[model samples]
Target: KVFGRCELAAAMKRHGLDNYRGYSLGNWVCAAKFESNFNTQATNRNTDGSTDYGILQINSRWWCNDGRTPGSRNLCNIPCSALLSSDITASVNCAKKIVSDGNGMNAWVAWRNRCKGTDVQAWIRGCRL
Candidate 1:
């Protein structure tokens, strides 16, 4: 479950997200590295797609959909489960569309910072969720 520096760097660039190849890797390496071990197959026990989905762990219903189960479809195009796959780049892309608008790793780093100390909710306190 350890991502070598080069491997991680490759993952970052492939997804069109940069700016963290330097010092920020230490911070990103903590949250994203832990949540899915940099693995895209990461899922939360609570995400029902109607409530949550995706790599950056987006909550479809609450954030995108209107908090309704069926209405969730209109929220995003990618399937909830699809977010969790070996393709970390895919996960990052999905997250960018629904969460960060493809702002790249900086958005992720911000999430880590705001959600660092607290519990579950901490992951997306300042990142517009």
Candidate 2:
């Protein structure tokens, strides 16, 4: 699912991601913008041999199980495949677990490089959920 920027922002809010873990809705929007461009099926392979899955690019090494991450912890206790659904329930849930596990938004290099301390508000200013 390639969602429009505002549509993805609303979807993120609906999944209880608004201001999650002291991260604003704008922050999430910004990260998603740079991470996956709101594409639900987006995927990337990390240099460490782990795969990043879904919109937030949740990593197989620490979050979901891909059965190929070498020493994956599967901290979210879910299959990596589940993260690619358009529904996004599993994706949002795993994201919460990531933050609660103390990884925070810094877990995403996209967030660090493109969203951290940026004008995140621009991502969702007129996008009401």
Candidate 3:
């Protein structure tokens, strides 16, 4: 599922991204834009031979159990496929774990490059939520 801006914003809030870990909902919105463009099925193969999965591009190297990443810790303890689903619960939970693991939003390179130190509120502009 590829969500529009407002739809993704509302989903992020409703699924516990509403200020979880001191990051605003807008940060998640912005990360999603640069990470995967709100596309549930988005995937990216990293040069290090790992693959990133889903909207936030959770990595197989440390987060998901893809059974292909050579040293994956599966820290998120979820099948990589779950992140590709429209039901975003798994992605959200895993992302929460990633943040709780002390990396915060900086785990996402896209977040650092585009969302960090920026007017992220504009990412959710005009959303009633």
Q: What tens digits encode model 1's per-residue C-alpha lDDT throughout 1-129?
A: 345445655565556554333323334434565555555544454544444444455555534443346645444555566655556655555554544444434445435554354453332234421
Best by lDDT: 3
> In lDDT terms, how accurate is model 3?
0.92
What is every candidate's alpha-carbon RMSD to the true fold?
8.7, 1.1, 0.8
* Model 2, C-alpha of 118: deviation from truth (Å): 1.2
Candidate 1 has what TM-score? 0.51
Question: Between which residue pairs do clashes occur in model 2?
Answer: none
Taking all chains together, each candidate's TM-score versus the true structure is: 0.51, 0.94, 0.97
Which candidate would rank higher by TM-score, 2 or 3?
3
lDDT of 3 by residue, 1-129 (tens): 999999989988988898899999899999998899889999999899999999999999999999888977898888999999999899999999998888889989989999999999898889989
Candidate 2 per-residue C-alpha lDDT over 1-129 given as tens digits, one digit per residue, 9 for 90 to 100: 888989888888888999888899999878877888889899999889999988899889888898888878988899999999998899999889887777688888989998898888888877656
Q: Give the TM-score (vs. native) of candidate 3.
A: 0.97
